[PDB]
Amino acid sequence: MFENITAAPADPILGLADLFRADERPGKINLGIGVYKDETGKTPVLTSVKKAEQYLLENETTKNYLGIDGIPEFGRCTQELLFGKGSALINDKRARTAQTPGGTGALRVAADFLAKNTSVKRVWVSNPSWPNHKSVFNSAGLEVREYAYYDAENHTLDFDALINSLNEAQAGDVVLFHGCCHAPTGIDPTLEQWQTLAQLSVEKGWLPLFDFAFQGFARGLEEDAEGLRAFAAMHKELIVASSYSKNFGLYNERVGACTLVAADSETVDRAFSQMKAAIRANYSNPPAHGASVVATILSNDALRAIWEQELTDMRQRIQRMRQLFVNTLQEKGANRDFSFIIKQNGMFSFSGLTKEQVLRLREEFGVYAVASGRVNVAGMTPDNMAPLCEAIVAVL
Amino acid sequence: MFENITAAPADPILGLADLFRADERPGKINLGIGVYKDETGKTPVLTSVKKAEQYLLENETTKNYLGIDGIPEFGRCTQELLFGKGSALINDKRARTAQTPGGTGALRVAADFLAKNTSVKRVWVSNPSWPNHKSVFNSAGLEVREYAYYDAENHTLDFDALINSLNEAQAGDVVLFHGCCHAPTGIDPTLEQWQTLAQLSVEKGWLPLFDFAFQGFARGLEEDAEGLRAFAAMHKELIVASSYSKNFGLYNERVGACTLVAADSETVDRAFSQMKAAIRANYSNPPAHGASVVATILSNDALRAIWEQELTDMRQRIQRMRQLFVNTLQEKGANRDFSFIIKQNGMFSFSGLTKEQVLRLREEFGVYAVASGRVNVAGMTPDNMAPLCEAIVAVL
Ligand SMILES: *Cc1c(COP(=O)(O)O)cnc(C)c1O
Ligand SMILES: *Cc1c(COP(=O)(O)O)cnc(C)c1O
Missing domain, CATH: 3.40.640.10 (Type I PLP-dependent aspartate aminotransferase-like (Major domain))
Incomplete structure (x- = not known):
């Protein structure tokens, strides 16, 4: 009755969850979390x-x-x-x-x-x-x-x-x-x-x-x-x-x-x-x-x-991170304008990165984000912001 | 968009819940509870x-x-x-x-x-x-x-x-x-x-x-x-x-x-x-x-x-009540044979009462049961067993 049951598709985000949690690189950042995290990187x-x-x-x-x-x-x-x-x-x-x-x-x-x-x-x-x-x-x-x-x-x-x-x-x-x-x-x-x-x-x-x-x-x-x-x-x-x-x-x-x-x-x-x-x-x-x-x-x-x-x-923390994000990128420098970031509300926004860019961000730096370029701001901390932006700059 | 929405039917059991909880008669027993209750008549x-x-x-x-x-x-x-x-x-x-x-x-x-x-x-x-x-x-x-x-x-x-x-x-x-x-x-x-x-x-x-x-x-x-x-x-x-x-x-x-x-x-x-x-x-x-x-x-x-x-x-309590039920009915006496009660498992069983019988049981005694005659054994306590059986006998 189930032998010809076709498998359900790879969850459009959860794949990242597992993929990420398989990177021995501990400078890694998961921006595809879909949930709030404090500055400790915890969902208390x-x-x-x-x-x-x-x-x-x-x-x-x-x-x-x-x-x-x-x-x-x-x-x-x-x-x-x-x-x-x-x-x-x-x-x-x-x-x-x-x-x-x-x-x-x-x-x-x-x-x-x-x-x-x-x-x-x-x-x-x-x-x-x-x-x-x-x-x-x-x-x-x-x-x-x-x-x-x-x-x-x-x-x-x-x-x-x-x-x-x-x-x-x-x-x-x-x-x-x-x-x-x-x-x-x-x-x-x-x-x-x-x-x-x-x-x-x-x-x-x-x-x-x-x-x-x-x-x-x-x-x-x-x-x-x-x-x-x-x-x-x-x-x-x-x-x-x-x-x-x-x-x-x-x-x-x-x-x-x-x-x-x-x-x-x-x-x-x-x-x-x-x-x-x-x-x-x-x-x-x-x-x-x-x-x-x-x-x-x-x-x-x-x-x-x-x-x-x-x-x-x-x-406020989400607001701080969008703010800290926008100017740390303007510090690590690149022809950009991620100022729309500061005008957006909530945990998410489209970083504006192409699928190839997000790909090398993952593979080459350990920054995980959704293919759509969607980024979860609550995944950023004052401590991981610098490497985050460096990686971001290195792929623009 | 909802003006011609036809009302959903009266819940086949929940009606009893409300009906029961509207009887100033405190000798009342609800046998249509659908949930376990201890000898205190509590679901702890x-x-x-x-x-x-x-x-x-x-x-x-x-x-x-x-x-x-x-x-x-x-x-x-x-x-x-x-x-x-x-x-x-x-x-x-x-x-x-x-x-x-x-x-x-x-x-x-x-x-x-x-x-x-x-x-x-x-x-x-x-x-x-x-x-x-x-x-x-x-x-x-x-x-x-x-x-x-x-x-x-x-x-x-x-x-x-x-x-x-x-x-x-x-x-x-x-x-x-x-x-x-x-x-x-x-x-x-x-x-x-x-x-x-x-x-x-x-x-x-x-x-x-x-x-x-x-x-x-x-x-x-x-x-x-x-x-x-x-x-x-x-x-x-x-x-x-x-x-x-x-x-x-x-x-x-x-x-x-x-x-x-x-x-x-x-x-x-x-x-x-x-x-x-x-x-x-x-x-x-x-x-x-x-x-x-x-x-x-x-x-x-x-x-x-x-x-x-x-x-x-x-x-065991459920087993005790079925047992106590069967012989308290044989004590209050009526041409019966509720012995099948003792051979049944769990909280429920069909008492074998007709819809008219359950009706007068509710209206005339304050014993609430489902129209199908279904009875919840866990609703019986050593203390409410006597009146329960008296009512049961008075309607047979
Ligand atoms: C989180 C969310 C939901 C609701 O999800 P639950 O986790 O099921 O509470 C619905 N819509 C949006 C846009 C969401 O962000
Ligand atoms: C209680 C019950 C269920 C399950 O109900 P839940 O309250 O949703 O856990 C299903 N089937 C039967 C026969 C039941 O007695």
Whole structure:
């Protein structure tokens, strides 16, 4: 029954993981990490989460199942973070949040829900976008199309081509947006562009789907939410897939949420039930631990205070490295202009290196990066910055 | 886009949950709980798991992502539990285990894998079987058919009708088996019947899929695995979906596994990669916590010792209650024969009550049970047994 099963493709990034971890050269740097790392080159567990965990340890009395949609406090804390503490969506109760196993889980339950309960057949994804997008939607039967986004020359948001390609999209098509810290580019629409996008969106009848995995990594928790809120003020319906994987350093506890927004409570409840049936046909109910840690931190003043400090510390280090990167390259010197680096947000951005350049960077220097030239800024430390830039300069 | 979304149906059991928790009558008993409860009527967290957790708390240094298939020690411990410590499947390395979010997650990833990578179109499920089965397979596009199993009259395994209805199944059809503690009946094939089933299975070309959610609840960890091992000795290919949800009291940490078995390592690796791609299009990688707790307990002699004691304590209490049930009914007296109760394994069994009988049991006495007459034995305590039986007698 499985003898003619064709092997799945070499993971588009994980190959680097293994390849890298096979280099006896210890001056090696992996910039294709896809996860945050501190100046020690470590992905630690936040101090706030450890405290949250001793708390759960001392207070949990049962591991009994959570409801299909997870811990309730977790849902409210997430919609407050997304739409803001006093938002009308919240008061009018037109948003329902389901806790899910990471942001990918949120994206697949949306996909399944949308595919079994609506007429949507295609999903517009930016080109480029976080990889796993295509597989998730296709696996649910949604056709994926791509809209323009990135300007190779100016290393910028090609808004014109963007709004120009989105015009092929019909009413009822789902259009996927990264809320902040666009991956892999690091370019985000400015608030005005978010507002025009919202307006065009309402006019064309797009169903917006927000992938919000980096809240707090661009400017702050509230600022990062402005684009989504720009849409939420405009739309009757939207879906948001959030992840706490990164802003809480809870990668492996699979904590995320899929929030549905409809015109009124009555329709959101009706649509949510089918989203619940989609959850029940998949993994049944979600993993309590990670979501539990988030809910206790966000609901505790002292713990939330420490976390936010931890998040800004992370945000700032990423900002420091982009900054230190740009001028250490201008110190090691080469006809360049990696200044767009400083204007980009989040952990990733396209270095602008060609596949041959990244190749010799790996093979000849021990610097590992994705073939697309994508580079993870959090992989740089004040200590590995110099050799990094030397290698970078030696291949330009 | 969601205004004409039709509401999902009232959850076939959860309705009772809410209904029950709305009865000011405190002599009420919920027998439709679907989860284990101790004599206190509590679903506690095992002592062994709490210790495992203080350990993780003191030793974890990163929440970084696990690989698509979860923690490796978790995989090996599970295949040892399933196939036995020295099994040929293990040595010949023809089994691959993916950690998943509960047994339902394991069942959906199998379904998705089987639907995208093989020619299977229908899945044979027993009638009756644990409910959520149909939704999972259908959601992956597999047609579900049912084979005969339960004998209403004798309250027994109607083997004849069983093997008779399975004859409609074609080669390449997937046939789903509960490894032990069949839900909802509590009737398991005897080892000889497991052996004849294995043999017919090989002859007809069925792909066996084992749903093994109650290992250790019937006779013991190894005994409970004999049927599956009876098949594993016979088949080139099989799939097993295990859950630790119940035997570890880890319901909400969503810990389970989907184990694939092929003819050789080479084909198991090839098929597993596609199963990994199916995991990546769903939730990406699994929740570490619950799986981490299991792996540390099972790999630690002192902790595994305590757990096993905890499991047998649970197994025995369920056995005590079935026993205490049967004769307290014979004490409160009624033309009955609930002796088949004592021959059934696990938490569930069909009481043999009609839907009208269960209805007045709820409405008139405060005893909640599923319309099918299914009763959860772990919901009975030495203290609520008397009124339980009185109510039962008053409606016969
Ligand atoms: C990280 C990420 C996700 C979510 O991943 P999880 O690890 O499953 O939480 C989704 N979209 C983008 C753009 C991401 O960066
Ligand atoms: C509990 C159970 C499952 C698995 O459920 P999870 O709670 O998702 O671990 C699967 N099959 C049967 C028969 C069950 O009893």
